[model samples]
Every structure is written in structure tokens, then in C-alpha cells.
Target: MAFPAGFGWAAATAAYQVEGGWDADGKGPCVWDTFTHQGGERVFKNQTGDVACGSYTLWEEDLKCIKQLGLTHYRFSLSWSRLLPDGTTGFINQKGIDYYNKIIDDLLKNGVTPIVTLYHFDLPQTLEDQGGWLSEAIIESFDKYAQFCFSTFGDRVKQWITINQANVLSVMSYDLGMFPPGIPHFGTGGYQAAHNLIKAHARSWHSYDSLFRKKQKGMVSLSLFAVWLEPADPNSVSDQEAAKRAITFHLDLFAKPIFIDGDYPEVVKSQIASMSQKQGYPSSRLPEFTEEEKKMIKGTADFFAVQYYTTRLIKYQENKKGELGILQDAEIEFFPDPSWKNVDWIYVVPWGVCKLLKYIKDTYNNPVIYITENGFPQSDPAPLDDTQRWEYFRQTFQELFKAIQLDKVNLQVYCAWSLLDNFEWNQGYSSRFGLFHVDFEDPARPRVPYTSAKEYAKIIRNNGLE
Candidate 1:
């Protein structure tokens, strides 16, 4: 495996899952507040993020913790709802901006590069009440929001992520309805909602490029969680096509529009057309991209943010998985690998990373890539002997090395999934994917370094293959 230059060890976290002070300082409620507040919506331990690590009040300490952990770079998201309480109009909270400014300035002082994400899953509930991602207003709203961020924080940070897990968050919130404003209808509601999300992200990307890059000199992109697929039955071409449909319809729905020119994949159009016709729908489940919209969104990203954890084994089947309605197919089988586990139902097949990098290199003409989020969930606290995690890193980076070696994958940075574990969204902290173990019950939320943290630190200091 050919290794790239310099060490690129980094850690990540999202705002809502870590930063608390939910309603402090006149902040509006996010969709998450409403969802978790409702009795039945949250998972084990009744984990509402009302006090989520209280990181907002404790951010200076959080920065101290990052410095203690020796992270060269730390990636975290900006809470849209917390700062822009009304989404637009009303007032821009000075306190919120002040909070981030302090953090950015502190990171700069300590020689830690702050990688900022403009949007995570937390959308201001005010926006969701107005149909959220389903409304076209979101595009303009996000553009305004992006411009504000670039103007404010871009001076301190050179790297920026516009959206985190566009595929994961948008699908969960819209189609699967596992998140806030959870609306689960395919042909109309879900489709329109996702359409607006894609457009909003594109608008933010373009806005950042045109309005901020020159002044701020920072990078802009989006994070996408994609699962790799291998035919469950090695010799079946039909299963391969079904897997293609799954990716094209789901992952590629967002990726193709941004990375692969200015259009959705043909497979997506074909599949949505089939679904609409079979279900007797008047419009395609996926919205159409107008010519002007297409040009406006083209080549907007500075780089691609990739968050990969495990691989999937696919096979062809003849029955639908019931009301999952959108991808109901008689020709696709989605199965979790049993041999190894890192994340829920995700088998730790590290070579899958090499294959995925190869796909990106071959498919999209080798754009600059960042391993935005990559790490495993440890069930045990601190897992002081984290052999599993060390092995996982060794193998995945080896694939990244291969991408540089044989494939010439222009990969530049790799940020671990988390710095410390906080609330795990839908699963409600059931999965611990952090290098630092978070004490949930403790009001102070102390972070204890796990064994993997040491191993990862070494890798970063040494630059993966150093």
C-alpha cells in the first residue's frame, strides 16, 4: 500500500448530540427537541438531548479536552436552530455566534484546525413546521444561513463542510421518518422533501463558493454515509443490477446531482418511473431538476466528504419488505454481514474501503476526498484494550493506502467518527463510537480516553502509513 504524506488524524462530533442548552438564550426548539420530548419517540434511557453533554455551556472545557487528546484537527457542526432561532428574520443570536467564535479562536491559538459543518440533522423546528426540506424556501434559507457562517467563522477555519450525512439525515427525516419532521410517503411528500434538501445543499454550496471562498479562503462540501455492496450470491448479474438500483436510488440520488455532473443517475430515473407507474402515481417519486437549477448547482463542491463504516452483502429476492414502500422490489435482497461487526449490522470488511475508493476514483474522476467519519462502535466502556478498533483502523487505512498506491485516489484527510460519544440520534446512545468514553449519567459528562484513542493518536501523529 502506498501511503500519502503527513499524518491526518482527526476527530468529529455533531452539535445537537453534544451541545446542550436547548432553550437557553432564547433559542427555538429543534425538531429533535419535539421528537425526544414526545414520550415514545426516543430510544433506551429516555435519552433526550435536553442537556446533551451540556457542551454549549461547557464548550471551553470541550476545547480543553480536544487539546488534551492531542487532535490535530477537530470537526464539529454548527446548530442551525440554536443560532438562527427563527431560521430567518427575527434576530441572529450574538451569543451563539460568540460561542463558536471563542471555540474557533481557541482552536487557532492551540494549533488545531477546526473543520466546521454548516448543517447536521438538527433543523430549526420553525423551518420544519413550514414543510422543512419539502419547501423551496429552504434553498434560500440555507443560502442566507451559509453566507452568515462564511462571513463569521470562515476567517478562522480553512475547511468547511456544508452538510453532514446528506444521504443519512435527509432519508431518515424524510422517507424513513426516523428523524424530526418524520414524513414517510414516497411518491409525493418524501420525494419533494428530499428534492428540496438536495437543492438547499446545492444552493449553500454555490453560495459559499461565490460569496465566501474568496474572502474566507476555506473549503466547502457535504458528508454522505454510503454502504458498500457485494453480491450475496457472487455470480448473479440480476442481483448486481438490484444493488445498483439501491445505490442509485438512495446514495446516488444526492451524489449524482453534485458529483457526477448535474443530473440524477439514469438508474434513479428509471426506478422512480417504475415505482410511480406501478403505484398509479401522476408524478415521479423523485422531482425533476430544472435546467437553470442544474446549471446553478453544477461543480459547487470543493471536495467530497465520505463517512463509511461497513459493507453490505446483496442478493436478489422476490418479496417486498412491506410498507418500506419506496424501494419495494421483488428483485433485491439486503443482508447484513455476520462475520464481523463495527456498527449496527455492519460487518467490518475493511477491504470494502479500498473497493469504495476505487469506485470513487473510477466513477467521479478522482476528486479530492476526505474520510470525514470512520470509526467503530464499542459496546464496552473505554474498551481500554481496543484491539478491534486498532485492527479496524489498520485495515481501513491500508485500503486508503491502496487507493493512493494503485488507484491514485486523491484522498487527503481522515477524521475519525467521533471525539467522544454523546447522544446517538435514533438509537439514543446505544452505540458508542467515540475514542473518548462519555459519562452520560454524570452531570459534568467527563470524557475518559479509551484504548483506541491512544492507537489512533499514534496513527495521526505518524500520518497513517508513516
Candidate 2:
């Protein structure tokens, strides 16, 4: 199986996830730092990213990983606090800028494409203190931050992701309270944060278009963490519609606005309106975008950015009493695909990966889409051989190739979830997603590639599995 020419093979990492040196080089504190340090109770065995993989210092090593694999692209994010110190402060941290500059320059020097994400959930702790995404003023602050990055690095970095997995940032952080600034408001809080995030993205897109697009010639987009939900019982109408609502409320909530005609889906608004009225809220639980805001954001994206992993069998439940969160709004429950191997929320559903690609093509007018993050994870105790991960990608690519060649999906880039096994958020060092296993216990934090890297490297070099 062969992919089209110019198809990019990449590895993805976030600032807080892989980059250690929390306070090094004049970087300020971020929400993850504060959350993980609160207590060992919050994360797995109190693991924090105080020195995660030491990527801040070992970035050169990561470049070698990219080069060794012969990958065409490397996707990573910048730390907001590391660059701006305070979210709203006008002061620029030249050290943070210099650090990322070196990364961009080095990646290009090795003939790897640098796909940079502007924000990847590492918000400045100072911003959260002042109301975070709930504040409308975040639009102004984020606009400036995004513009600063464009002006600083836009010349070399042609593909800019304004935000990565924005829905995850809003839902996990505010609704479920699984991540930082943990507030489990579900309905009210999550929607408010999501509202601000969409606007913030549009404003950033506009900033680049007005300032950097012509001279820099870069493409800007944001990513949504998507799960392909199918009815557990295909013949059941309730399950079918439930799957649609689950996708609408989860994936479409972020995607439809940017790719479609720029308004929230009609079903979403109506469902949340009914829920709010029944729950005695004065207005709809989902926030509304002004007409101008809608128009501004409609065509902002150059491509549809999707990060999908895991598909679930969504079945309807008649025995539900009520709901507060997005999941409950659909009145469904998620079950693992019986045929696939499991790891918590992730299931090895390769067919679902292809189906999701088709859905994006048919749903959003067939816009160019990038598979931003896709990979399997293992428990920390798993062996370095990682035959499971290798097989998972092998099957996943078989289906992904079907979408590209047979189904005619406009997928241009495939970025694996990560480069190194670093801090996995609250799962801490326990959940490993990297192709290369990082010995976090060692002072050097040495990089040792798993067998999966060997298999994936073959695919990268051949441009397909041969």
C-alpha cells in the first residue's frame, strides 16, 4: 500500500507532556504544574512533570528520533507561561522564544516539517486565576499570544495549529474536572469555556490572516479530539440517533462551527435548550455565537484537523433519570468493541478509523483533513518490545490507507500521538504513548525506542507498508 506523494509522517508532543524544565530558562508556572503538585492523590502516585523526559534539555535527542525515523514532519506545542509568563502580560520571554526557535530551525535542518501547535492545554496559571476560558477577555489575550508566535516563528513554520483538542481542554478541564482548573460543572461551565475557546481560535486565525499569512505563507487550523461513536445495536433507532447526538455534542460541537457554515448545529442548540428549560436554567446550556462572530470563524480553517483514537459502541439506555454533562445529554452508554483489545478508554477499532475519515469527508464538504494524533498506549510495566502497539498501527494503517486510496479522503498528514514516553497528564508516567520509551527514572532520561518504532519507521521510509 502506498500513500500519495507529500504525505507527511510525524510524531506529536505537547509542551507540558514531554518538555521538562518547568522553571528553567525563565519559564513561568502553568496549570499542570500547580495541579500535579497539589497532592499525590490527584495523579498516579503523585507523579508530576517537574522534569518530564527533560525534553526541554533533550530536544536535540528528540530531533535525532525524528531524523532516525525519516519522518517528514514533527508536531509539538509551545508553553504559554513559558513564553508569556502571564497570560495577559505584554512582556515577552525571549528565552522561551529562543528555545522554540531552535526547535523549528533544527527540525528544518534535518529535513523534517515543523508543525507547531500554539496552545496544547498548558495555560498560564495566572490566566486561570483570572477566570480562564470563562472570561471573554481571553479572546484578546490569546489573540496577542497567537500573533506573537506568528510574528516570531511564522517564517519557518508553515503549518500552525491554533489549539489542539480544544474540546478536550474544555470538557476535561471544566466539565469532568479530570484535568487542571478542575471544575465539574458539566453543563454550564464546560459550555462557557468552549464558547470562549472557539472565539479565541477565530480571533487568532484573523490575527494571522491580517498580519502573517501573506508574508509567512502558513496555514492555520485547530484540532478536535474525536471518537467515532457507532450504535451498539445498529437496528435500534434510539441507538442510532444517540450516536449522532454523541458525535454532534462531542465532535461537531467544535468542528461544525469552523468547517460548516459557522453556526452550532441545530440539534445541539435545541437539545441543550430543552435541557436548560427542564433544569430551570434561564437560557440554553450551550452558548451562542454572535452573527458576526459566526461569519468571522466560518472559513478560518485551511484544513479540518482531527485527532481520533478509539471508537466505542454507543447504546441507548431507557433507564436514565437525568443528565448534567455532554454524555448524559445523549442518553447513551459507551461499551468497548468486543473484537478489539482494550486499554481503558482506547479500543483497537481500525475500521472505525476509516469510517471516521469518511464521516469527516461527507460531513464538512470534504475539506482537507489531517490525522493529527493516532497511536496506542501501554501500561508502564509493558515490555519494550511493544508488539501490541506495532500490530495496532499495522492494522490501523491498513484501514487508513483504504480511506485514502479507496474512499478518496483528503488526508494529507498522519502524526502519531507522541515522540517519547513522558508525563501522561494525571495518569502521570504510568500511561505510555510514545514510540520511544523514556527511562524517566534515570538522570539522563535516556531514549530507548520500542519495537513499534521499528515497524513505523519502515512505513515512514517506504511511504507505506510494503
Candidate 3:
């Protein structure tokens, strides 16, 4: 099966996950930096991304890997602290700017496009002290940083992602308390942070649209982390409703306001409001968007950027007395198929991607879709052969082919999750999702292509299954 002509292929990496120059060249501390530095049950083995893949100094080597993969585009992120030490426009780091400029220029020289994500969960530590995503002040700070990015890199980088997985950032940091600045405030924190994040994204989008769009002719959107949910009991109306409600709360919480009608999902609003009422709140914990704010956020994205990896089966679960947080609000219980191959939190469900694509198309009016991150993660002591990873990609590509050809999904770009195995957040370096395996023990930090890398390269060469 051949992909559509002009279809784009890419491989992705995050700054904190790959760049690894934690304090070098005037980089300021970020939440991950502070979190790992605490060094007490925060991350696996208390490991930090202080010296991740050494891509900071060895970006040329990373670029070589990108070329070897034969990718048309490379999706990566910029460290906020690295760019603006205080996460404000008060000071711009020329060294940081120069560092990214070299990579962008080299990629262009090699005929590869740069898909730049402005934020990827590496919030400046300074911002956390100021209430992080929960504070509206971060919105203005983000706007300034985004405007700088547009004015500086917008000329060369046409595809811009305002934030990567805004929902995950909010949930993990606030609700679940898994990521940096870990605050498990349960029900209230996640919604607040997400609200501020949506506003930040809109501000950044408007900044680019009004300031740089005319001259740069670039596109901007936020990347979302999507997990497909299926009803556990296909014939049960409650289970079916639970699945829909879960998707509405998880994905549509962010997607609806930006992509749909610039408002939160009705299910999300009602569920949270009902939950809040039972909990003795004055109003819905889910903040209300002002009319003007809704108008500003509506239609901000130029395209839909999705980061999909796995799926879950949802069953109706009534909230228990005194229960709190996102799960309680949605009133659903989800689990992976026990028969499927699993790694960390992701399960191999190739068909799920197709269903998710169809849902996005049907629900969001068929916007242009970019699969920004999709790859399988293997446990540590991973085999260089990586046959399992290769099989995963093969199956996923087959499903994507069906999605594009049969379902008529508006899919255009597909980027594998990562280019190199680097730090995996709280999981540390235990989960390897890279096509090229990095030797963490070695000082050189060598990147060796895996079997999946070879197979993925072939897919890129053919532009589809061969």
C-alpha cells in the first residue's frame, strides 16, 4: 500500500529528553531539574536528564541519525529555561538560540523540515514558584516566549507546535502528581492548570497569527496526547457512555475548546459541575471561559497534532462517596487488554490508531492531522534487534494505511515518538522508545540504529508498506 503523494515522515525528540546540557551555556533550572535534584523517590534511581543523550554538544551526531533515518521532517522541542533562563522575555539566551539555529540550518541543508514544539513539559523552575500553569501570569510569559520564537525561528521553521501534550502536562503535574513540581491536588489542580494552558496556547497562536503569519507563512498548533478508549462491554449502554465520557473528559477537555467550538465539552462541564456540587463547592471546579477568551481560543490551531501510542477499554464505574480527581469525575475504569504486548503504560493496539483518527475526523470536522509521536517503548536491556518494535511499527503503518485510504482520514504527517533513547521522565532511562539506541554507560553517548530503525527507514523510502 502506497501513501498519498507528498505525505511527510518524521522522527521526534524532546529537549529535556535528548538535549541534556542541563546547566551548560547559561541554561536555567526547569521543574524537571528541580524535581530530579530533590533525589528522593522522585525518579527511577533518582536519575536526571542533566546529561541526557549529550545532544547539546553532539547535535551533529543526532542530525546524522536523522539523515540516516531518511526522514522528511524532524520534530523536536526547545527548553524554556534554556531559551529564557527565567521563562520570561527579560533575557534571551543567545547561546541557546545559536545552538538551535545550527541544527535548523543543518536540517534544511540536508532537505529535512523542522517541526518545532515550543514547550514539551520542561517548565522553567521559576515559573513553578509563581504557580506554574495554574497562574494566569504564565500565559503572558508564554506569549512573550512564543513571540520571540516566532520572530527568531519562525522564518525557517514553518510548522510550530505551541505546546506538547498540554493535557498530560496538567494532569501529570497537578492531578496525578507524576511529573515535575508534583502536586497531587486531585480534582481542582488539573482543571486549573489546563485552563491556563489553553489560554496560553491561544495567546501564543494569536501572537503568531497577528505578528508573524503574514511574513513567515507558518502554521501553529498544540500537540495532544491521545489514547483511544473502547467500551469494555460493547452491548452495554452504560459501558458505551462511559467510553464516550472518558474520551470527552480526557481528549476533548483540551481539543473541544481549541478545535471544536472554543468551549469545554458539555460532558466535561456537567460532570465536573455535578461532582463539585456534591463536594460542596461554590461552582464548577472546571473554570469558565469568558466569551472573549472563547472567541480567541476558537480556531487557533492551523492543524491537529496528535501523539498517540496506545488504547484502553473503558467500563462504567460509578464514583465512590468522597472520591475526587479526574478519574472520579469521569466515572470510568479503564485497563489494557491482558493479551496485548505491553510496555510501561502503553499497549500495542495498532487498530486503535485508526479508530482514533476516525474519531478525530468525525468529531472535529476532518481537520488536517499530524501524528507527531507514535512509537513503542521497550524495557531496559532492550535487544538491538528490536523485532517487537519493528512489528509494532509494521502493524501501526498498516492501520494508518487503512485510515488514509479507506477511512479517508485527513492524515498527512507521521512522526515516530523518538529518534534516540534518552531520559524517560519519572521512569528515567528504563523505557527505551528510540529507533536508535543510545549507550548511557558510555561517555561518548553513541546512538546505534536498531532493527526498527532500518525498517522505518525503508518505510520512509517507499512512503508506505512495501
Candidate 4:
């Protein structure tokens, strides 16, 4: 079997995760900087991106790796704080603009398409000081930032991801308090943050559509974190319903508003509303979008970008008294299959991606799809002869081929999670998800290719397995 003609292959990395020089060239602080600086308890071994991979200064080496890997595209992000130090357009940083322009020019010179993500969890610390995503004020701020990015880089960069994983951003930052600006608002905060992010995305899309689309001929969309959910007891109707609820609460929380309808999923709204009433709230905890807002937000994305890593088996669980938030409201419990090969939270189930593509096609009317982020992670001291990771990618591509050929999904692009290992967010540098291994202990941050990189290059060159 072969991939469809014109299918794109690439690898991805976020600015905070790869580019070090956290404060270089008048760059301001972002929440990740403050979060890791707080102490060792906040991140693994108190490791910070203070000098992650040195990609900020060593981008040429990174590009060399991209060419060697034979990628058709390279997906990376801009640091919001780096570009606009104060998180606003009051003082645009020329140095930051020049820095990105250099990379974009070089990528184009090497015949590699640049897929740019405007924001990726690195909200300006200045914004977090003012309640961050919790405040509607951010909607306008984000729109302005998006406009600047579009006008600045949209000329050469045809693919734009307005935001990366907004669903995860809302839940992790506001509800779970595991990420930056840690504040556990339980049931209400996540919903509110998602609400504001949805609007922010829509505003940016409209800005690009009106201002840049005809001239630049580019695409814009926000990426969502997608984890395929399956019923633990396939024979049980309640388990099946629980699986549906899990999918709607996690994936559809952002997707439905943008793709299906401008409003939140009916299951999501009804569940949260009833839960709020039982908890004695005056009205639904989930915010309602005005008719005008709905019309604006619906069909805002040019394409569906999904970051998929794993799958879970969900079982119906009765809601516990006094419990709150999305998980509690959905009335479902999910866990990885014990028999599946696993890393901390990611279970290696290649079939899940195929099912997910089919579900998106069937549910969202088969919109063009990009598998924006997907990869396997190994612990530190991982070997260059990484047969496990190679097998994982091979199986995943096989399943993706099945989805495209047999299931008829409109999939166009597939990007591995990272071109080289760097910071892995709160998990720190311990979780290595790179095709090339980076020696973090070395100040030079030398990158060495694993066996998987070579194998993946072959797959890309062939466009599929034989």
C-alpha cells in the first residue's frame, strides 16, 4: 500500500520545548519560565528550558536534521512573549521578527514548507498576571497577536495553527492546575477558559480570512488533543454511552463548536448543566454562546488539526456525591488496557488512530485532516537502536494507510512529535520523544539520530510501506 499522492510528512517541536535562550534578545518571560523557576516540585529535577536544545541559537543544526530526515514540512511555534515582549502590539520586537524570518527563509530555501503555530502553552507571564485565559480580555489580545503573525509571516508560511491543543490548555491550566498559572477552578474554570479560547480562535480566523486569505492563500486552524475512547465492555449499552460521553467531553469540547455547530455539544451542555443544578448553581456551569457568536465560530477552521497519542477504555461510572468538573460530570471512568505496551500515560494502540480518523470523517463531514502531532516517548539514556519506537511508527502508518484506503478519511499530513528531544513540559527532560537523541548534559546540546529516524526517513521517501 502507498500513501495518497501529495501527502505531507513532517516533524514538530514547540518553541518552549526546543528553543532555549529563554531571555535572549529582549524576550520577556512566559508562564513556563515562572512555573519552572518556582522550585523542583513544580518540574522534574527543577529542569527549565533556560537552555533547552539551544535551538534559538542552533537552529541551523536543527534545519540540517530536517533536511537529512527528508521531511516535506517542519511544524514549529513562535514564542508569544518572544515576539511581543509585553504580550501586546504596543512594542513589536524587530529582533524576534527577524529571528523567525531567518528560519522561514532557510526552510523555504531547503524546499521544506513551514507550518507555524502562533501559540503553544507559552502564554506571556504578563498575561497570566491579569488572570490569563480566565479573562475575556485575552480574546482581543490573542486576536491582535494573530493578526500580527499573519501579516508578518503568513506570506511564506501557508499553514497556520492559531493555537495548539486548546482543550488540554484549558483543562490543564485552569481546572487540573498541573500546568502554568496553576489554579484549580474545578468545574467552572475549564469551561470558561475553553469558551474564551474558542472565541479567540474564531476572531483570529476571521481576521486572517478578511485580511490575508485572498492575498496569502494560506490555511488557519486550531489543533485539538484527540484520544480515542472505547467501551471497556463493548456488549454493555451503558459502557458504549460512556465511551460516547468521554469522546464528546474531551475531543468535541473544542471540535464541535468549530466544526459541527457553533454551540457546545448537547451531551456536554446537558451533563454539565444538570451537574451544576445538583451542586446548587443558579444556572449551567457551561457558558452559552450568543447566536451571533455561534454563527461566527461555526466553520471557522480551514482544516482539522489533531494531536493524537493514545487510547483509553472507558467504563460507565456513577457520579460521586459532591464531585465536580468535566470528568465527574461526564460520569465515565477510563484507563489504559493493562495488556497494552505503555509509557507513563500513553498506550501503544495503533488501531486507535484508524478508528479516530473514521470517527472524525463520519462526524465532521470528512473535513481535510492533519495528524499534527504524534510520536512515542522513551526515558533518558534511550538507545540509538530504538527498534521499539521504529515499530510503533511502522504500525501507526499501516493503520493510517488503512484509514485512508479502506475507511476513506481525508487525511493529508502526518507530523512526528519532535525533530529532536528537548524539554517535555512539566515532565521535564526525562520524557524523550525525539527521532534524534539530544545530550542534555552537554552545553552544546549535540543531536544524534536514532534507528527510528533512519527508518522514518525511508517511510517518508517511499510515502508508505511496500
lDDT of each: 0.77, 0.88, 0.93, 0.93
TM-score of 2: 0.98
TM-score, per-candidate, Cα-based: 0.94, 0.98, 0.99, 0.99
Q: Candidate 1: global Cα-lDDT?
A: 0.77
Clashing pairs in 2: none
Q: RMSD per prediction, one decimal?
A: 2.2, 1.3, 0.8, 0.8
Better of 1 and 2 by lDDT: 2
Give lDDT tens digits, candidate 1, residues 223-247.
Answer: 8887887777777887787766666
Which stretches of model 1 miss by more than 4 angstroms? 1-3, 186-188, 318-324, 329-331, 380-382
Clashes of each: 2, 0, 0, 0
Q: Given candidate 1, what's the lDDT at residue 333?
A: 62
After superposing all C-alphas onto the true structure, candidate 4 shows an RMSD in angstroms of: 0.8
Clashing pairs in 4: none
Q: Model 1: clashing residue pairs?
A: 7-463, 232-314
